[PDB]
């Protein structure tokens with residue numbers, strides 16, 4: 001087990017388990033290296049430092065999800081509101097059923113344990129901005145198709161949706177007995193969309209088909 | 214009582230800059246200007262100290278929430294809405310209280326440390342119960358929409374408040390406590406409350422008492 005034989009995915013899988021178990025602060029390069037079956041030099045073979053490791057764990061789940069959201073605004077389909085619902089609701093289900101995904105999402109939610117460091121906060125800012133941009137674009141396509149209520153601002157709508165969804169994610173992390181990621185994510189999403197979306201455009205409470213492709 | 218208050222203040226300054234993990238009772242003492250003996254008299258450990266910090270803020274907030282369901286006034290939605298709007302305003306205008314609140318909202322680093330998640334859980338449960346009591350009184354008074362379930366309305370209100378607070382801690386310039394907090398509150402209340410019950414978009418008068 002020479003350090004240079006470690007693969008990037010094995011380094012990231014090991015680091016994500018370290019971070020889930022010990023948190024960001026207590027995780028060290030030596031711990032990540034040992035966990036993957038090597039020593040710290042196997043981590044250096046891929047990443048300058050622990051924050052690059054964190055960024056890469058985040059990117060690996062945030063990238064795919066941003067891709068899904070981006071598809072909801074396509075001019076090749078004429079149901080952007082339904083598509084946004086398909087993406088979000090299946091994401092909620094996935095987060096609820098896949099502990100590994102859920103624990104990475106919870107690493108980001110938890111953020112920096114003190115004002116001393118802003119390392120997770122900047123990644124969160126950049127992620128929030130990415131998600132908002134994409135939701136706002138889907139909502140702008142919905143307006144053109146006459147699917148929004150008169151006067152609905154798609155930028156405000158996107159901001160309200162992120163707020164009530166973010167709140168469900170934080171609540172479920174704190175007290176899963178009281179706040180249910182699937183059930184309440186879907187209620188927050190539908191409630192928020194119904195404030196900005198015309199009646200009759202989608203049926204609240206329904207499970208959409210996974211977005212095609 | 215007042216030495217208590219001094220430790221707590223200093224502990225606020227440490228907890229916010231340094232975090233829950235790296236702060237100890239000895240660091241808190243020094244900034245506070247007191248002896249280790251003096252400090253231990255009040256709090257034998259960091260968690261006892263955090264519990265009294267959260268308490269200081271969380272308690273009187275729960276007392277404001279609790280009042281909105283009083284069987285003595287007939288405007289529970291208006292009152293609950295007023296409490297949250299005023300709270301949002303106060304947080305936005307008082308950096309002291311806003312730092313104490315972020316200490317209160319930040320998560321434990323791991324799934325292994327908890328005692329701060331334990332007060333979050335208890336705090337989360339207290340706030341939801343009180344929201345639900347005010348919305349059930351609204352329901353009794355004919356102020357909720359047909360078929361609105363006060364338990365469900367309170368969960369959505371709670372998620373709404375929590376998403377605004379968290380949104381603003383990450384991106385103050387993208388999530389404005391006062392302006393987006395009021396928009397989000399009014400949106401979620403209008404999903405469950407009949408029209409004409411409160412006046413949206415405005416800051417209500419101070420509640421009595």
Ligand SMILES: Oc1cc(Cl)ccc1Oc1ccc(Cl)cc1Cl
Pocket residue numbers: 058061062063065066091092095104105108123124127
């Ligand atoms: O996009 C992300 C950004 C960060 Cl900073 C951390 C995790 C991420 O991944 C997700 C976030 C929210 C939802 Cl609802 C679903 C997924 Cl997969």
Ligand SMILES: Oc1cc(Cl)ccc1Oc1ccc(Cl)cc1Cl
Pocket residue numbers: 062105108109124126127128130131132161162163165166169
């Ligand atoms: O802001 C968001 C709003 C919505 Cl409705 C969906 C996903 C969002 O994106 C995130 C949610 C949580 C974390 Cl930790 C990171 C990111 Cl990017």
